[PDB]
Amino acid sequence: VKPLQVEPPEPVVAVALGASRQLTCRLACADRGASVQWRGLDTSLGAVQSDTGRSVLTVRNASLSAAGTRVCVGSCGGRTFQHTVQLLVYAFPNQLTVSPAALVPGDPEVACTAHKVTPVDPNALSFSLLVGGQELEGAQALGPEVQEEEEEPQGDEDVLFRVTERWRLPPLGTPVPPALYCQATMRLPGLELSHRQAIPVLIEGR
């Protein structure tokens, strides 16, 4: 084991907007004068260093600004040790809006919008159009359109995105499915978050 240990130890640690996370950095040192510093965003925020054997970095009610690279540096008898960890702050969408809200066999397209989300990148954020618990074959994804939340309103701060996937639909076939589903999935280190929303298929029009 190394003399400097951080818990949790993963190189990237995700925390939801509004949640909390604690990172504890421990330095084992037989000598006096051992110091532990948390920084990584200095300068911008500032670094904090004390002579001690344990320093705890605590994010409470996280904002998007809490995001970035953190470095714990421990100094023991002329030697320095380090641990670098990315704090990733995400907001999983709190609402999905489908358009049209219900489908009719013959509708050529359906859009699914995730509200107040970040990150928006496709390596993390994914949209699926499902019939049953399977992807609807023949559904052509037009590609996510990203807009900022859009003229934000009162409350707090932090800018989030609105992301819309759209699919050109294949014929639903027959027997006609009772429903399709849009699922937005966010995959981050150690996490998979999902929101599946029913899309009624009105066989008789409407």
Side-chain angles (χ1 to χ4, degrees), residues 82-141:
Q82 71 92 45
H83 179 267
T84 292
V85 48
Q86 216 92 96
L87 243 209
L88 193 166
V89 186
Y90 65 92
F92 188 78
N94 67 176
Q95 178 178 173
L96 251 48
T97 274
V98 185
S99 181
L103 282 167
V104 163
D107 288 330
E109 189 170 296
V110 67
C112 182
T113 292
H115 300 65
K116 287 154 68 172
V117 58
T118 184
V120 294
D121 86 283
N123 273 70
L125 180 61
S126 288
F127 289 83
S128 291
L129 183 58
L130 306 170
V131 48
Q134 308 307 356
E135 297 191 350
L136 176 64
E137 297 166 23
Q140 176 191 40

Side-chain angles (χ1 to χ4, degrees), residues 143-187:
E145 310 170 34
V146 178
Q147 300 179 176
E148 279 171 7
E149 283 282 359
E150 251 154 353
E151 35 181 21
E152 197 145 75
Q154 195 214 56
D156 267 322
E157 339 255 0
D158 288 348
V159 163
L160 300 171
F161 304 104
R162 189 164 288 195
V163 181
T164 299
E165 178 57 285
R166 274 178 217 275
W167 293 268
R168 271 267 122 180
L169 300 165
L172 295 178
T174 165
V176 174
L180 294 168
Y181 304 80
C182 168
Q183 175 169 136
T185 298
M186 183 174 290
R187 298 181 171 82

